[PDB]
Short mmCIF file of all heavy atoms in Angstrom, two decimals:
data_model
loop_
_atom_site.label_atom_id
_atom_site.label_comp_id
_atom_site.label_asym_id
_atom_site.label_seq_id
_atom_site.Cartn_x
_atom_site.Cartn_y
_atom_site.Cartn_z
N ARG C 66 9.35 2.12 -24.01
CA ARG C 66 10.65 1.50 -23.80
C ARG C 66 11.71 2.57 -24.01
O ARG C 66 11.63 3.33 -24.98
CB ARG C 66 10.86 0.33 -24.75
CG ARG C 66 12.17 -0.40 -24.53
CD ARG C 66 12.36 -1.51 -25.54
NE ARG C 66 13.66 -2.16 -25.38
CZ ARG C 66 14.80 -1.64 -25.82
NH1 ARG C 66 14.81 -0.47 -26.45
NH2 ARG C 66 15.94 -2.30 -25.64
N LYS C 67 12.66 2.65 -23.09
CA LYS C 67 13.67 3.70 -23.17
C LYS C 67 14.59 3.48 -24.36
O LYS C 67 15.13 2.39 -24.55
CB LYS C 67 14.46 3.75 -21.87
CG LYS C 67 15.16 5.07 -21.60
CD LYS C 67 15.70 5.11 -20.18
CE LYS C 67 16.21 6.50 -19.83
NZ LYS C 67 15.11 7.50 -19.85
N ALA C 68 14.76 4.52 -25.18
CA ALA C 68 15.63 4.43 -26.34
C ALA C 68 17.07 4.78 -25.95
O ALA C 68 17.35 5.24 -24.84
CB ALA C 68 15.13 5.35 -27.46
N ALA C 69 17.99 4.54 -26.89
CA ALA C 69 19.40 4.79 -26.63
C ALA C 69 19.68 6.26 -26.31
O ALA C 69 20.66 6.55 -25.61
CB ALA C 69 20.25 4.34 -27.82
N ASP C 70 18.85 7.18 -26.79
CA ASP C 70 19.00 8.60 -26.51
C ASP C 70 18.23 9.04 -25.27
O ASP C 70 18.00 10.25 -25.09
CB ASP C 70 18.60 9.43 -27.73
CG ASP C 70 17.15 9.21 -28.15
OD1 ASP C 70 16.44 8.43 -27.47
OD2 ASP C 70 16.73 9.80 -29.16
N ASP C 71 17.81 8.10 -24.43
CA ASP C 71 17.07 8.34 -23.19
C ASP C 71 15.65 8.84 -23.40
O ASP C 71 14.98 9.21 -22.43
CB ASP C 71 17.83 9.22 -22.19
CG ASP C 71 18.90 8.45 -21.44
OD1 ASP C 71 18.97 7.22 -21.59
OD2 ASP C 71 19.68 9.09 -20.69
N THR C 72 15.15 8.85 -24.64
CA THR C 72 13.76 9.18 -24.87
C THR C 72 12.90 7.93 -24.72
O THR C 72 13.38 6.80 -24.78
CB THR C 72 13.56 9.78 -26.27
OG1 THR C 72 13.89 8.79 -27.26
CG2 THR C 72 14.45 11.00 -26.45
N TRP C 73 11.60 8.15 -24.53
CA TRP C 73 10.65 7.06 -24.32
C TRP C 73 9.97 6.72 -25.64
O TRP C 73 9.19 7.51 -26.18
CB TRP C 73 9.62 7.46 -23.27
CG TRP C 73 10.18 7.52 -21.90
CD1 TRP C 73 10.42 8.64 -21.15
CD2 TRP C 73 10.59 6.40 -21.10
NE1 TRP C 73 10.95 8.28 -19.94
CE2 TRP C 73 11.06 6.92 -19.88
CE3 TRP C 73 10.60 5.02 -21.30
CZ2 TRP C 73 11.54 6.10 -18.85
CZ3 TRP C 73 11.08 4.21 -20.29
CH2 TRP C 73 11.54 4.75 -19.08
N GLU C 74 10.27 5.53 -26.16
CA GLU C 74 9.73 5.05 -27.43
C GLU C 74 8.42 4.31 -27.19
O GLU C 74 8.35 3.48 -26.28
CB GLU C 74 10.71 4.10 -28.08
CG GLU C 74 10.32 3.63 -29.47
CD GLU C 74 11.29 2.62 -30.04
OE1 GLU C 74 12.49 2.95 -30.15
OE2 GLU C 74 10.86 1.49 -30.35
N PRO C 75 7.38 4.56 -27.98
CA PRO C 75 6.13 3.80 -27.84
C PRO C 75 6.37 2.30 -27.98
O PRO C 75 7.13 1.86 -28.84
CB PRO C 75 5.26 4.34 -28.98
CG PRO C 75 5.84 5.68 -29.30
CD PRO C 75 7.31 5.57 -29.06
N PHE C 76 5.74 1.52 -27.10
CA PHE C 76 5.94 0.08 -27.13
C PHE C 76 4.66 -0.74 -27.17
O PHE C 76 4.57 -1.70 -27.93
CB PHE C 76 6.82 -0.36 -25.93
CG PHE C 76 7.11 -1.83 -25.91
CD1 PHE C 76 8.08 -2.37 -26.75
CD2 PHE C 76 6.42 -2.69 -25.05
CE1 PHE C 76 8.35 -3.72 -26.75
CE2 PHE C 76 6.69 -4.05 -25.04
CZ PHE C 76 7.66 -4.56 -25.90
N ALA C 77 3.65 -0.37 -26.38
CA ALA C 77 2.41 -1.13 -26.30
C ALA C 77 1.37 -0.21 -25.67
O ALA C 77 1.70 0.86 -25.16
CB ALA C 77 2.58 -2.40 -25.46
N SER C 78 0.11 -0.64 -25.71
CA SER C 78 -0.94 0.12 -25.02
C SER C 78 -2.22 -0.69 -24.97
O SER C 78 -2.34 -1.75 -25.60
CB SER C 78 -1.18 1.48 -25.67
OG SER C 78 -2.01 1.33 -26.78
N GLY C 79 -3.19 -0.19 -24.20
CA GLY C 79 -4.49 -0.82 -24.15
C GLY C 79 -5.31 -0.26 -23.00
O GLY C 79 -4.91 0.70 -22.33
N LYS C 80 -6.48 -0.86 -22.80
CA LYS C 80 -7.38 -0.51 -21.71
C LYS C 80 -7.73 -1.77 -20.92
O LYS C 80 -7.85 -2.86 -21.49
CB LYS C 80 -8.72 0.07 -22.22
CG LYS C 80 -8.78 1.58 -22.35
CD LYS C 80 -10.18 1.99 -22.80
CE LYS C 80 -10.40 3.50 -22.71
NZ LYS C 80 -10.58 3.99 -21.32
N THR C 81 -7.93 -1.61 -19.61
CA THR C 81 -8.30 -2.78 -18.82
C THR C 81 -9.69 -3.27 -19.17
O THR C 81 -10.59 -2.50 -19.51
CB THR C 81 -8.23 -2.49 -17.32
OG1 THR C 81 -9.10 -1.40 -16.99
CG2 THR C 81 -6.80 -2.20 -16.89
N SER C 82 -9.86 -4.59 -19.05
CA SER C 82 -11.12 -5.28 -19.29
C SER C 82 -12.05 -5.14 -18.09
O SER C 82 -11.74 -4.48 -17.09
CB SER C 82 -10.83 -6.76 -19.50
OG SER C 82 -10.43 -7.34 -18.27
N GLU C 83 -13.20 -5.81 -18.16
CA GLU C 83 -14.13 -5.84 -17.04
C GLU C 83 -13.54 -6.51 -15.81
O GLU C 83 -14.05 -6.31 -14.70
CB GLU C 83 -15.45 -6.50 -17.44
CG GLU C 83 -16.29 -5.67 -18.40
CD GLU C 83 -17.69 -6.22 -18.59
OE1 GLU C 83 -17.86 -7.46 -18.59
OE2 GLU C 83 -18.63 -5.41 -18.74
N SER C 84 -12.48 -7.31 -15.97
CA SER C 84 -11.79 -7.89 -14.82
C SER C 84 -10.68 -7.00 -14.30
O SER C 84 -9.96 -7.39 -13.38
CB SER C 84 -11.22 -9.27 -15.18
OG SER C 84 -10.17 -9.16 -16.12
N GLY C 85 -10.51 -5.80 -14.87
CA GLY C 85 -9.42 -4.94 -14.46
C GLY C 85 -8.08 -5.33 -15.04
O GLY C 85 -7.06 -4.80 -14.60
N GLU C 86 -8.05 -6.23 -16.01
CA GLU C 86 -6.80 -6.76 -16.53
C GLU C 86 -6.58 -6.32 -17.97
O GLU C 86 -7.53 -6.15 -18.75
CB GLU C 86 -6.78 -8.28 -16.44
CG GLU C 86 -6.79 -8.76 -15.00
CD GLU C 86 -7.01 -10.25 -14.84
OE1 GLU C 86 -6.97 -10.98 -15.85
OE2 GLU C 86 -7.24 -10.69 -13.69
N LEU C 87 -5.32 -6.13 -18.31
CA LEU C 87 -4.91 -5.86 -19.68
C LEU C 87 -3.88 -6.91 -20.07
O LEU C 87 -2.76 -6.92 -19.54
CB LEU C 87 -4.34 -4.44 -19.80
CG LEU C 87 -3.80 -4.07 -21.18
CD1 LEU C 87 -4.81 -4.38 -22.28
CD2 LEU C 87 -3.43 -2.59 -21.18
N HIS C 88 -4.28 -7.81 -20.96
CA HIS C 88 -3.47 -8.89 -21.50
C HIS C 88 -3.10 -8.57 -22.94
O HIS C 88 -3.66 -7.66 -23.57
CB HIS C 88 -4.25 -10.21 -21.47
CG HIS C 88 -4.69 -10.64 -20.11
ND1 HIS C 88 -4.05 -11.62 -19.39
CD2 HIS C 88 -5.73 -10.23 -19.33
CE1 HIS C 88 -4.66 -11.80 -18.23
NE2 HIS C 88 -5.68 -10.97 -18.17
N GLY C 89 -2.16 -9.33 -23.48
CA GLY C 89 -1.84 -9.22 -24.90
C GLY C 89 -1.04 -8.00 -25.29
O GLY C 89 -1.03 -7.63 -26.47
N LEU C 90 -0.34 -7.38 -24.34
CA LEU C 90 0.43 -6.17 -24.64
C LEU C 90 1.59 -6.45 -25.58
O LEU C 90 1.91 -5.63 -26.45
CB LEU C 90 0.95 -5.56 -23.34
CG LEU C 90 -0.12 -4.80 -22.55
CD1 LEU C 90 0.33 -4.63 -21.12
CD2 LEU C 90 -0.39 -3.46 -23.22
N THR C 91 2.26 -7.59 -25.42
CA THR C 91 3.45 -7.88 -26.21
C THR C 91 3.56 -9.39 -26.39
O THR C 91 2.70 -10.16 -25.94
CB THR C 91 4.69 -7.25 -25.56
OG1 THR C 91 5.82 -7.38 -26.44
CG2 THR C 91 5.00 -7.89 -24.22
N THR C 92 4.61 -9.81 -27.08
CA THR C 92 4.92 -11.22 -27.24
C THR C 92 6.32 -11.45 -26.69
O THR C 92 7.09 -10.51 -26.51
CB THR C 92 4.91 -11.63 -28.72
OG1 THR C 92 5.96 -10.93 -29.41
CG2 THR C 92 3.56 -11.31 -29.34
N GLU C 93 6.63 -12.72 -26.42
CA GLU C 93 7.94 -13.02 -25.85
C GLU C 93 9.07 -12.53 -26.75
O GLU C 93 10.04 -11.95 -26.26
CB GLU C 93 8.09 -14.51 -25.56
CG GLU C 93 9.42 -14.85 -24.90
CD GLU C 93 9.65 -16.34 -24.74
OE1 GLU C 93 10.19 -16.96 -25.67
OE2 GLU C 93 9.29 -16.88 -23.67
N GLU C 94 8.94 -12.73 -28.07
CA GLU C 94 10.02 -12.36 -28.99
C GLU C 94 10.24 -10.85 -29.02
O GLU C 94 11.38 -10.39 -29.19
CB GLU C 94 9.73 -12.85 -30.41
CG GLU C 94 9.25 -14.28 -30.53
CD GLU C 94 7.74 -14.40 -30.40
OE1 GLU C 94 7.03 -14.17 -31.40
OE2 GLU C 94 7.27 -14.71 -29.29
N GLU C 95 9.18 -10.06 -28.90
CA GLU C 95 9.30 -8.61 -28.99
C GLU C 95 9.76 -7.97 -27.69
O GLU C 95 10.25 -6.83 -27.71
CB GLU C 95 7.95 -8.01 -29.39
CG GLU C 95 7.51 -8.36 -30.80
CD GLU C 95 6.11 -7.86 -31.13
OE1 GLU C 95 5.19 -8.08 -30.32
OE2 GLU C 95 5.95 -7.23 -32.19
N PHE C 96 9.61 -8.67 -26.58
CA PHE C 96 9.81 -8.11 -25.24
C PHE C 96 11.20 -8.52 -24.79
O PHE C 96 11.39 -9.56 -24.15
CB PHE C 96 8.71 -8.65 -24.33
CG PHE C 96 8.60 -7.98 -23.01
CD1 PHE C 96 8.79 -6.61 -22.86
CD2 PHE C 96 8.23 -8.71 -21.90
CE1 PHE C 96 8.66 -6.01 -21.62
CE2 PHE C 96 8.08 -8.12 -20.67
CZ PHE C 96 8.30 -6.76 -20.52
N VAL C 97 12.19 -7.69 -25.11
CA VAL C 97 13.58 -7.98 -24.78
C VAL C 97 14.07 -7.01 -23.72
O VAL C 97 13.30 -6.21 -23.17
CB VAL C 97 14.47 -7.93 -26.03
CG1 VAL C 97 14.05 -8.99 -27.02
CG2 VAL C 97 14.42 -6.54 -26.65
N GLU C 98 15.35 -7.12 -23.37
CA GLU C 98 15.92 -6.26 -22.34
C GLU C 98 15.67 -4.80 -22.67
O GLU C 98 15.80 -4.36 -23.81
CB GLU C 98 17.42 -6.52 -22.21
CG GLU C 98 18.10 -5.80 -21.04
CD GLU C 98 18.39 -4.34 -21.32
OE1 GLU C 98 18.65 -3.99 -22.49
OE2 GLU C 98 18.34 -3.53 -20.36
N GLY C 99 15.29 -4.06 -21.64
CA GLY C 99 15.12 -2.63 -21.75
C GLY C 99 14.56 -2.11 -20.46
O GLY C 99 14.22 -2.87 -19.54
N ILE C 100 14.50 -0.79 -20.39
CA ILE C 100 13.78 -0.11 -19.33
C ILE C 100 12.41 0.24 -19.89
O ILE C 100 12.31 0.90 -20.94
CB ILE C 100 14.53 1.13 -18.83
CG1 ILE C 100 15.86 0.72 -18.20
CG2 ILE C 100 13.66 1.90 -17.85
CD1 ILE C 100 16.77 1.88 -17.86
N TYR C 101 11.37 -0.20 -19.20
CA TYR C 101 9.99 -0.02 -19.64
C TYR C 101 9.25 0.88 -18.65
O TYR C 101 9.54 0.88 -17.45
CB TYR C 101 9.28 -1.38 -19.78
CG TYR C 101 9.86 -2.23 -20.88
CD1 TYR C 101 10.98 -3.01 -20.67
CD2 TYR C 101 9.30 -2.20 -22.15
CE1 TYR C 101 11.52 -3.78 -21.69
CE2 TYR C 101 9.83 -2.95 -23.18
CZ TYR C 101 10.93 -3.73 -22.94
OH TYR C 101 11.46 -4.48 -23.96
N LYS C 102 8.31 1.65 -19.18
CA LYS C 102 7.47 2.51 -18.36
C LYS C 102 6.02 2.22 -18.72
O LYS C 102 5.64 2.33 -19.90
CB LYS C 102 7.78 3.99 -18.61
CG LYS C 102 6.77 4.95 -17.94
CD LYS C 102 7.21 6.41 -17.99
CE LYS C 102 7.14 6.98 -19.40
NZ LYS C 102 7.30 8.46 -19.38
N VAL C 103 5.24 1.81 -17.74
CA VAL C 103 3.79 1.69 -17.88
C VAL C 103 3.20 2.96 -17.30
O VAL C 103 3.38 3.24 -16.10
CB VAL C 103 3.25 0.45 -17.15
CG1 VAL C 103 1.73 0.35 -17.35
CG2 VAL C 103 3.93 -0.81 -17.64
N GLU C 104 2.51 3.73 -18.13
CA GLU C 104 1.90 4.98 -17.71
C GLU C 104 0.39 4.79 -17.73
O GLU C 104 -0.22 4.70 -18.80
CB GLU C 104 2.32 6.10 -18.65
CG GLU C 104 2.08 7.48 -18.13
CD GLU C 104 2.96 8.48 -18.83
OE1 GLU C 104 2.67 8.82 -19.99
OE2 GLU C 104 3.98 8.90 -18.24
#
Side-chain angles (χ1 to χ4, degrees):
Chain C
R66 183 182 177 282
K67 201 169 189 63
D70 60 2
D71 282 353
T72 64
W73 289 109
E74 185 183 302
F76 182 78
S78 81
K80 268 183 170 285
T81 59
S82 70
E83 290 191 324
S84 68
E86 295 170 11
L87 177 50
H88 301 258
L90 284 161
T91 188
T92 65
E93 183 186 88
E94 314 87 83
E95 293 175 311
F96 192 37
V97 297
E98 187 281 328
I100 296 171
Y101 294 84
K102 171 170 71 168
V103 181
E104 196 158 76

